[PDB]
Write an enzyme that holds these catalytic residues in place. Structure first.
Site, PDB file in Angstrom:
ATOM      1  N   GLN A   8       0.886  -1.339   0.051  1.00 30.25           N
ATOM      2  CA  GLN A   8      -0.036  -0.038  -0.135  1.00 30.25           C
ATOM      3  C   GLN A   8       0.645   1.421   0.104  1.00 30.25           C
ATOM      4  O   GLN A   8       0.492   2.282  -0.665  1.00 30.25           O
ATOM      5  CB  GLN A   8      -0.888   0.050   1.073  1.00 30.25           C
ATOM      6  CG  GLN A   8      -1.922   1.260   1.280  1.00 30.25           C
ATOM      7  CD  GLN A   8      -2.967   1.162   2.304  1.00 30.25           C
ATOM      8  OE1 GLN A   8      -2.806   0.186   3.159  1.00 30.25           O
ATOM      9  NE2 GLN A   8      -3.718   2.089   2.504  1.00 30.25           N
TER      10      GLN A   8
ATOM     11  N   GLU B 229      -4.504  -6.876  -0.529  1.00 32.81           N
ATOM     12  CA  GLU B 229      -5.868  -6.293  -0.115  1.00 32.81           C
ATOM     13  C   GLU B 229      -6.396  -5.689  -1.094  1.00 32.81           C
ATOM     14  O   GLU B 229      -6.038  -4.445  -1.730  1.00 32.81           O
ATOM     15  CB  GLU B 229      -5.761  -5.387   1.077  1.00 32.81           C
ATOM     16  CG  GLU B 229      -6.847  -5.200   1.949  1.00 32.81           C
ATOM     17  CD  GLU B 229      -7.777  -4.270   1.504  1.00 32.81           C
ATOM     18  OE1 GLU B 229      -7.428  -3.330   0.645  1.00 32.81           O
ATOM     19  OE2 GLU B 229      -8.975  -4.401   1.835  1.00 32.81           O
TER      20      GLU B 229
ATOM     21  N   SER C 187       7.583  -0.102   1.166  1.00 37.78           N
ATOM     22  CA  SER C 187       7.606   0.342   2.861  1.00 37.78           C
ATOM     23  C   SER C 187       7.719  -0.540   3.780  1.00 37.78           C
ATOM     24  O   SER C 187       7.549  -1.673   3.500  1.00 37.78           O
ATOM     25  CB  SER C 187       6.336   1.153   3.080  1.00 37.78           C
ATOM     26  OG  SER C 187       5.075   0.261   3.477  1.00 37.78           O
TER      27      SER C 187
ATOM     28  N   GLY D 231       3.602  -4.387   5.927  1.00 38.21           N
ATOM     29  CA  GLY D 231       3.824  -5.728   5.611  1.00 38.21           C
ATOM     30  C   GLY D 231       3.740  -6.207   4.252  1.00 38.21           C
ATOM     31  O   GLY D 231       4.769  -6.551   3.854  1.00 38.21           O
TER      32      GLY D 231
ATOM     33  N   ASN E 140       2.409  12.643   0.529  1.00 35.30           N
ATOM     34  CA  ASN E 140       2.950  12.161  -0.821  1.00 35.30           C
ATOM     35  C   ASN E 140       3.222  13.089  -2.049  1.00 35.30           C
ATOM     36  O   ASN E 140       3.990  12.615  -2.828  1.00 35.30           O
ATOM     37  CB  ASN E 140       1.611  11.053  -1.441  1.00 35.30           C
ATOM     38  CG  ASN E 140       1.496   9.900  -0.408  1.00 35.30           C
ATOM     39  OD1 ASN E 140       2.347   9.210  -0.023  1.00 35.30           O
ATOM     40  ND2 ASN E 140       0.271   9.713   0.050  1.00 35.30           N
TER      41      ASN E 140
ATOM     42  N   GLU F 246      24.777   6.484 -14.401  1.00 32.22           N
ATOM     43  CA  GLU F 246      25.832   7.116 -13.835  1.00 32.22           C
ATOM     44  C   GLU F 246      25.023   7.777 -12.415  1.00 32.22           C
ATOM     45  O   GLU F 246      25.163   8.922 -12.052  1.00 32.22           O
ATOM     46  CB  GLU F 246      25.984   8.346 -14.771  1.00 32.22           C
ATOM     47  CG  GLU F 246      26.321   7.919 -16.280  1.00 32.22           C
ATOM     48  CD  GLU F 246      26.693   9.149 -17.177  1.00 32.22           C
ATOM     49  OE1 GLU F 246      26.989  10.458 -16.425  1.00 32.22           O
ATOM     50  OE2 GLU F 246      27.058   8.861 -18.118  1.00 32.22           O
TER      51      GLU F 246
HETATM   52  N1  LIG Z   1       4.221   7.558   2.023  1.00 32.73           N
HETATM   53  C1  LIG Z   1       3.500   6.831   2.672  1.00 32.73           C
HETATM   54  N2  LIG Z   1       3.359   6.042   3.807  1.00 32.73           N
HETATM   55  C2  LIG Z   1       2.477   5.438   4.282  1.00 32.73           C
HETATM   56  C3  LIG Z   1       1.176   6.177   4.092  1.00 32.73           C
HETATM   57  N3  LIG Z   1       0.357   5.593   4.776  1.00 32.73           N
HETATM   58  C4  LIG Z   1       1.024   4.616   5.923  1.00 32.73           C
HETATM   59  N4  LIG Z   1       2.237   4.729   5.281  1.00 32.73           N
HETATM   60  C5  LIG Z   1       3.419   3.794   5.727  1.00 32.73           C
HETATM   61  O1  LIG Z   1       3.137   2.497   5.498  1.00 32.73           O
HETATM   62  C6  LIG Z   1       3.563   1.683   6.564  1.00 32.73           C
HETATM   63  C7  LIG Z   1       2.532   0.255   6.781  1.00 32.73           C
HETATM   64  O2  LIG Z   1       2.025   0.012   5.702  1.00 32.73           O
HETATM   65  P1  LIG Z   1       0.594   0.682   4.831  1.00 32.73           P
HETATM   66  O3  LIG Z   1       0.808   1.535   3.708  1.00 32.73           O
HETATM   67  O4  LIG Z   1      -0.159   1.442   6.353  1.00 32.73           O
HETATM   68  O5  LIG Z   1      -0.327  -0.715   4.578  1.00 32.73           O
HETATM   69  P2  LIG Z   1       0.212  -1.960   3.678  1.00 32.73           P
HETATM   70  O6  LIG Z   1       1.513  -1.100   2.634  1.00 32.73           O
HETATM   71  O7  LIG Z   1      -0.936  -2.387   3.008  1.00 32.73           O
HETATM   72  O8  LIG Z   1       1.126  -2.892   4.614  1.00 32.73           O
HETATM   73  P3  LIG Z   1       0.190  -3.957   5.364  1.00 32.73           P
HETATM   74  O9  LIG Z   1      -0.469  -3.395   6.801  1.00 32.73           O
HETATM   75  O10 LIG Z   1       1.150  -5.167   5.801  1.00 32.73           O
HETATM   76  O11 LIG Z   1      -0.986  -4.420   4.461  1.00 32.73           O
HETATM   77  C8  LIG Z   1       3.270   2.612   8.188  1.00 32.73           C
HETATM   78  O12 LIG Z   1       4.323   2.481   8.861  1.00 32.73           O
HETATM   79  C9  LIG Z   1       3.447   3.906   7.407  1.00 32.73           C
HETATM   80  O13 LIG Z   1       4.711   4.345   7.572  1.00 32.73           O
HETATM   81  C10 LIG Z   1       1.106   7.322   3.203  1.00 32.73           C
HETATM   82  O14 LIG Z   1      -0.042   7.768   3.169  1.00 32.73           O
HETATM   83  N5  LIG Z   1       2.158   7.617   2.475  1.00 32.73           N
HETATM   84 MG   LIG Z   2      -2.310  -3.383   3.527  1.00 37.43          MG
END
Ligand SMILES: Nc1nc2c(ncn2[C@@H]2O[C@H](COP(=O)(O)OP(=O)(O)OP(=O)(O)O)[C@@H](O)[C@H]2O)c(=O)[nH]1
Ligand SMILES: [Mg+2]
Ligand SMILES: Nc1nc2c(ncn2[C@@H]2O[C@H](COP(=O)(O)OP(=O)(O)O)[C@@H](O)[C@H]2O)c(=O)[nH]1
Ligand SMILES: Nc1nc2c(ncn2[C@@H]2O[C@H](COP(=O)(O)OP(=O)(O)O)[C@@H](O)[C@H]2O)c(=O)[nH]1
Ligand SMILES: [Mg+2]
Lengths: 53, 430, 432, 132, 430
Positions: free
Chosen positions: C11, C64, C133, C137, C221, C247
């Protein structure tokens, strides 16, 4: 009637604080581009030497 | 007769050649469409110097442009004076050297050089004869530093009797453009010193110094630097193109400039360059021209020349001037700067004259002086290189395509030996 | 003849990529319907259909359904291919074991099939830009395997990761430190370079320039979206002096292992009160290296500098750049590591930046983006060290990792990986 | 994670919802803007129509709706290359590198603008020779 | 002008034929009545192949409709485009077949077959220079396989000079539609390999194939499945009705696709078939199509084409496309799949280009293929036969019309022979 709480006329939602100044409307409207300047182009690059005069 | 071809590599060389061709076209009167529009008969007398002819009466330049990446060549083609070149001459790869000598000299360049060498051979054999190869490129960029040196090596291996001229813009430490610049610079210097008949380095640091102090136009762009390099270029070849009282070709310049086989590095300077505010104010005279063309600030490199005494220096005056004034000024200067001229090579100033001047001005002078002061650039490059090499930093790429530390040791040893042998004569006395 | 493959996983990558695509779309005037209302620039990040609209070179991977379904139903539903938005059914539930050993396997294979399709359409692939990220997860599990899969499948091509590490003090989950150490190992030995964009600092950036005290994730973002544009500005627009993707690790990787750096963006001043300052390059650069411009929570002052590659976009004449280098070097607050006397890689571009309508940003005529590698980066990994050490003493939350198919020892081995990385940083900084 | 059979009247995010909705003949297509995309109750007093996707009706022959395809679909090669010497122009596709259309070709005026401004502009030749 | 006549029997044959005439109806520009409302002149010069002419200018297809039961006939005229067919002894019965092969070929069919051959002779002789016959029927159905085939036998006995084509749909074991289905199929295959020159098999079980795994429509109905067969059928005669670079009629295919007398069984397919979802984002060009045609899933027959090897194959390219790409793609596909093509016969792919693609598309290709793999189809059908015969199940029904078990063994006797003989080339080496 809720904006003028001194908490809605400042600290908005999803947007910059509305510090209402006034831009000079003759500029800033179409494409005015901030900045000190556009690195004013001088006279000549090549004609400086080989004077052609 | 005694014609010269032009082959250039890298973005720097590409731009420099693209400007030099424009300069020469303006000088001869060639319009962009390729059809002659000169005025005087002498405007055509020596059109064999740089131009070949095809059917229909139009003219094309005998230049083969090579660059590993297509952006620079594509940009150069579509601008002014991009339609004179034969597209058949263009050759390029599709990868990008990434400033890596390994990529530009062992893996990619080795395969990519076949077509370029074939086209170079065809062009050389096509016309009556050959006299030399003039090459423009930079020692700091990967693609140039590799392909240009490899091309020079193969060219020498194929032609053993023609001279070669190369200009490289060595990276002055003050202003840098790449973190790995010292590596490729030193390695290319090694690869060149062994097989380069002539090289005259031009320093962008002195470029900027002059483009500020002399002209006094506040915000010159890359165009002005490229022009001045190109004008300096034309200063050395105008002799082979126009008549005069004492012609002096590239071979004659070599004869009068190179004392020993291991000394083929020169630093040049162009005059006059008058500020727009004063051009009507400065007077045009032989004493002033000579004083400037011996002026320290007028030369193209930051390496201070007063830090040593010239081994030998020659100049190619352009325009109409009585030879006696040139000779008398040369005598007076040689007497007045005795301490700055070695004491075992008497009468160590060369002279020449050309009739038709450049476009618009009257008297023009190009200076080419092999001064012992050129030690400083190599010394500073070595000073940075030793520190860079103490920790093997960035060395894992250079080992990642077959090149090992033995090659670096050999290159550094050769460069240091060159520096030592070059400082040897400074203390030499008769 | 140059292109890049964009892979978004998780996500965090999905949303950030979602916002950035609006920035890219406007830069070339491609409307949402895909047709152009009215030179060969779009080739870098678009693929022609032969006649008509354009499609982006990206593939979205997530488990998801909800988040993607919004993408497949939003105002830009008409951009991507209908069949490139692969999705699963069961979430990873923030347990990394689910994203790499039990569930993520059943869809990782599908990713290679589609990707080889795009690559075949491509002709001169240059590199990959993958977003993942660590605190996420699904991205965490699928980030680790994908990097391993790509390296075997493709080989010597380069890759970078715009990861989003946890904040030193701000936290979003409770088991975030666990997934980072496991995931970090997957990226050190398979990724040539990674970018640090810890979310905590970005909030600080928002307050001191825009005067905003309720930023939303779209606001956060947006800033990253412009950051990516700066790196790729040269690949598609003409300029006086260009810098290529190949480079980047040529001038930013002292050794094979040390491949981490944190970037900063500026000037960031909107139409509110930006007119009151010059915005000349000489002064814009000064803001570049101030501690408040570090898009990552770290103190550059704590250590030396190895090599910084800063790319300019705008009308800056090259000369004003040179005076900047002299000004920065003379300074005493920022000290360079001993063994790189010259380490500045200077970039220039001509096309000015763009502004997404209705956004916080304004339209300034000069823009500078910095990708600086600093020894201070060890602070971020050093600080996460205590988070791992404290919990494993009591093995809290461990019991959900053993039962999902991950061996217990996997945790133990990760300890050495970060331990060596911390040791090397201090080793490099010592002067000769 | 297996494909489920159709159960819910389409509009739910359940499996195979993207393809089904693409159909124009289905009433589901062409939903209402204010349905979704609603900031607040009062901002827009009421709904509006937007349409969903832009797809042909029959799955086969999906290239319909393009008049350009209609125009060229009914010509023969023999009628495309031998039409007449009077007004026949080449149609083969050359290499892009050879059709760059240099700037000088882009704007003819700049072509003649050059020359007199630079060619044969106050040059001096009066050679100092006995014959001349 | 080498016209062809279409005769369809049984429910399946009638339905498929009903759509077949529908697609052709639109392309030539024929309204549901038959007054021309096309645009160009390319739709009238060769309109004689499928449509005759009558007073008032209305075009009426030269078609034959024939079934032993009235329900199917009444429906066809019931829908739109049913006003076209000739009301003319237009053969239909009032007894029904009831899925009994013997019933439709000896007692019930015979008493009505005489009349049908009367009209078919009438319509066929109308043409100036006959080209051949094409028939669509079914094997698992009563009227089609039984009463239709007897018509096939008669035709050959009177016009050996013309070639006959068919579009035969055989049951597939996976999908069940009849219990006595295995019998009537085997009793019919024997009767075609002796007279029919060309046979192309379409499996109703497969037809979901592209429909559900590639076309991806949730609720296709029999209306949808019919076009796919229709799509391929109209493409076989692409050159026969429009100009082109390389005209290739049916007779070309027979000598070009049937190396031996008794291996004239082919499986066909159609592309490019893309779902309603991605209708726009995929490029239609030579590279894209050629990769789809040889994909196993795309083919219309249940047999996997990767379980054996090919001997011959035909490609009927449609639409204006450059020749070189077609040839290059054909060669490129051949070499990369050498293991899938027999070795003793070289150059086992042919090409053909028409001047016009179907309405609403730019490029289209129809694939007609002969594969040793088609043996996999019969073995399952034959395998069912042996298991169900040792108990003489359902045998008494077929023995009530004089058909004596002495012939059933004969029918199965040849069935295996076609399996054995057709197979010995799967590994034969020269
Ligand atoms: N750059 C950015 N990072 C985000 C945002 N929202 C949540 N995150 C980061 O995403 C991390 C967790 O992943 P999420 O994006 O919330 O959810 P996910 O990517 O689906 O991961 P899962 O929860 O395992 O399904 C958090 O610790 C945040 O630091 C966002 O709007 N922008
Ligand atoms: Mg998720
Ligand atoms: N004088 C001049 N020098 C240039 C120009 N462009 C680049 N350079 C020099 O070229 C050096 C970098 O060379 P590089 O581009 O890596 O060589 P390449 O590998 O052939 O592209 C820099 O130090 C610049 O000083 C130009 O337009 N004029
Ligand atoms: N594809 C397709 N197959 C059909 C259709 N109708 C019947 N069939 C096939 O025909 C077989 C039954 O044929 P049948 O009705 O007994 O033929 P009849 O004896 O002439 O009436 C079934 O196994 C089906 O597979 C149709 O509309 N489409
Ligand atoms: Mg013929």
């Amino acid at each position: 009637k809720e904006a003028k709480y001194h908490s809605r006329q400042v600290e908005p939602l999803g947007k910059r604080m509305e510090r209402n100044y006034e831009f000079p409307q003759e500029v800033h409207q179409d494409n005015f581009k901030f900045g000190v300047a556009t690195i004013n182009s001088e006279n000549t690059a090549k004609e400086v030497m080989f004077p052609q005069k | 007769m005694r014609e010269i071809v032009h082959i250039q590599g890298g973005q720097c060389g590409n731009q420099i050649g693209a400007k030099f061709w424009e300069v020469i076209s303006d000088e001869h009167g060639i319009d962009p469409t390729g059809t002659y529009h000169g005025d005087s008969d002498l405007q055509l007398e020596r059109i064999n110097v740089y131009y070949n002819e095809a059917t229909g009466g139009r003219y094309v330049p005998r230049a083969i442009l090579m660059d590993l990446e297509p952006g620079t060549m594509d940009s150069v083609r579509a601008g002014p004076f991009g339609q004179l070149f034969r597209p058949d001459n263009f050759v390029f790869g599709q990868t990008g050297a990434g400033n890596n000598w390994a990529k530009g000299h062992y893996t990619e360049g080795a395969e990519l050089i076949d077509s370029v060498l074939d086209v170079v051979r065809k062009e050389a054999e096509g016309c009556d004869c050959l006299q030399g190869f003039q090459i423009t490129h930079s020692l700091g960029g990967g693609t140039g530093s590799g392909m240009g040196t490899l091309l020079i090596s193969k060219v020498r291996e194929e032609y053993p009797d023609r001279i070669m001229e190369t200009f490289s813009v060595v990276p002055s430490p003050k202003v840098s453009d790449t973190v790995v610049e010292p590596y490729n610079a030193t390695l290319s210097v090694h690869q060149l010193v062994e097989n380069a008949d002539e090289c005259m380095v031009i320093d962008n640091e002195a470029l900027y110094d002059i483009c500020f102090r002399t002209l006094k136009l506040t915000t010159p762009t890359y165009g002005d630097l490229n022009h001045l390099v190109s004008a300096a270029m034309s200063g050395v070849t105008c002799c082979l193109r126009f008549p005069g009282q004492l012609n002096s070709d590239l071979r004659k310049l070599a004869v009068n400039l190179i004392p020993f086989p291991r000394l083929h590095f020169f630093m040049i300077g162009f005059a006059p360059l008058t500020s727009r505010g004063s051009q009507q104010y400065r007077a045009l005279t032989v004493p002033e021209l000579t004083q400037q063309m011996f002026d320290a600030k007028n030369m193209m490199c930051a390496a201070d020349p007063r830090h040593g005494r010239y081994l030998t220096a020659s100049a190619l005056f352009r325009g109409r001037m009585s030879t006696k004034e040139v000779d008398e000024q040369m005598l007076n200067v040689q007497n007045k700067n005795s301490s700055y001229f070695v004491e075992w090579i008497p009468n160590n100033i060369k002279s020449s004259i050309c009739d038709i001047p450049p476009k618009g001005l009257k008297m023009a002078v190009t200076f080419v002086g092999n001064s012992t002061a050129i030690q400083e650039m190599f010394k500073r490059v070595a000073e940075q290189f030793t520190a860079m090499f103490r920790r093997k930093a960035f060395l894992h790429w250079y080992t990642g395509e077959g090149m090992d530390e033995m090659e670096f040791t050999e290159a550094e040893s050769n460069m240091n030996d060159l520096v030592s042998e070059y400082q040897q004569y400074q203390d030499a006395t008769a | 003849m140059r292109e890049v493959i964009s892979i978004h996983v998780g996500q965090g990558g999905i949303q950030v990529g979602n916002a950035c695509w609006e920035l890219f779309c406007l830069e070339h005037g491609i409307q949402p319907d895909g047709q152009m209302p009215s030179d060969d620039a779009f080739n870098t990040f678009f693929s022609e259909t032969g006649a008509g609209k354009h499609v982006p070179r990206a593939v979205f991977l997530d488990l998801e359904p909800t988040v993607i379904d919004e993408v497949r139903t939003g105002t830009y539903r008409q951009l991507f291919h209908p069949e490139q938005l692969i999705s699963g059914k069961e979430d990873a539930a923030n347990n990394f074991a689910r994203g790499h050993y039990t569930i993520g396997k059943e869809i990782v294979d599908l990713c290679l099939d589609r990707i080889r399709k795009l690559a075949d359409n491509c002709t001169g692939l240059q590199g990959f830009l993958v977003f993942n990220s660590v605190g996420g997860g699904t991205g965490s599990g699928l980030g680790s395997l994908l990097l391993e899969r790509l390296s075997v499948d493709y080989g010597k091509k380069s890759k970078l990761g715009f990861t989003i590490y946890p904040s030193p003090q701000v936290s979003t989950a409770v088991v975030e430190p666990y997934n980072s150490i496991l995931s970090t190992h997957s990226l050190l030995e398979h990724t040539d370079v990674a970018v640090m964009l810890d979310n905590e600092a970005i909030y600080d950036i928002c307050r001191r320039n825009l005067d905003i005290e309720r930023p939303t994730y779209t606001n956060l973002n947006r800033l990253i979206a412009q950051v990516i544009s700066s790196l790729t500005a040269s690949l598609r627009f003409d300029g006086a002096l260009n810098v290529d993707i190949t480079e980047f690790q040529t001038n930013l990787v002292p050794y094979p292992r040390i491949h981490f750096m944190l970037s900063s963006y500026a000037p960031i001043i909107s139409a509110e009160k930006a007119y009151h300052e010059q915005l000349s390059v000489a002064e814009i650069t000064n803001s570049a290296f101030e501690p408040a411009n570090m898009m990552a929570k770290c103190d550059p002052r704590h250590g030396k500098y190895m090599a910084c590659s800063m790319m300019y976009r705008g009308d800056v004449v090259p000369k004003d750049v040179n005076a900047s280098i002299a000004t920065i070097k003379t300074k005493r607050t920022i000290q360079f590591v001993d063994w790189c006397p010259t380490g500045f890689k200077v970039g220039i571009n001509y096309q000015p930046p763009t502004v997404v309508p209705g956004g916080d940003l304004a339209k300034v005529m000069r823009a500078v983006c910095m990708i600086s590698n600093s020894t201070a980066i060890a602070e971020v990994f050093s600080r996460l060290d205590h988070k791992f050490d404290l919990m494993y003493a009591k093995r809290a939350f461990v019991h959900w990792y053993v039962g999902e198919g991950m061996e217990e020892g996997e945790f133990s081995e990760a300890r050495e990986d970060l331990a060596a990385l911390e040791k090397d940083y201090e080793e490099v900084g010592i002067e000769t | 994670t297996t494909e489920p059979e159709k159960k819910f009247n389409s509009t739910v995010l359940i499996g195979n919802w993207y393809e089904e909705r693409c159909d124009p003949n289905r009433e589901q297509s062409k939903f209402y803007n204010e349905r979704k995309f609603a900031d607040n109750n009062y901002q827009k007093y009421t709904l509006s129509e937007n349409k969903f996707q832009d797809t042909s009706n029959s799955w086969l022959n999906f290239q319909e709706n393009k008049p350009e395809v209609k125009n060229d679909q009914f010509i023969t090669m023999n009628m495309q290359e031998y039409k007449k010497p009077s007004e026949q122009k080449r149609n083969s596709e050359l290499k892009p590198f050879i059709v760059k259309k240099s700037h000088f070709d882009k704007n003819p005026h700049e072509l003649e603008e050059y020359r007199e401004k630079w060619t044969k502009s106050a040059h001096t030749f009066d050679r100092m020779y006995l014959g001349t």
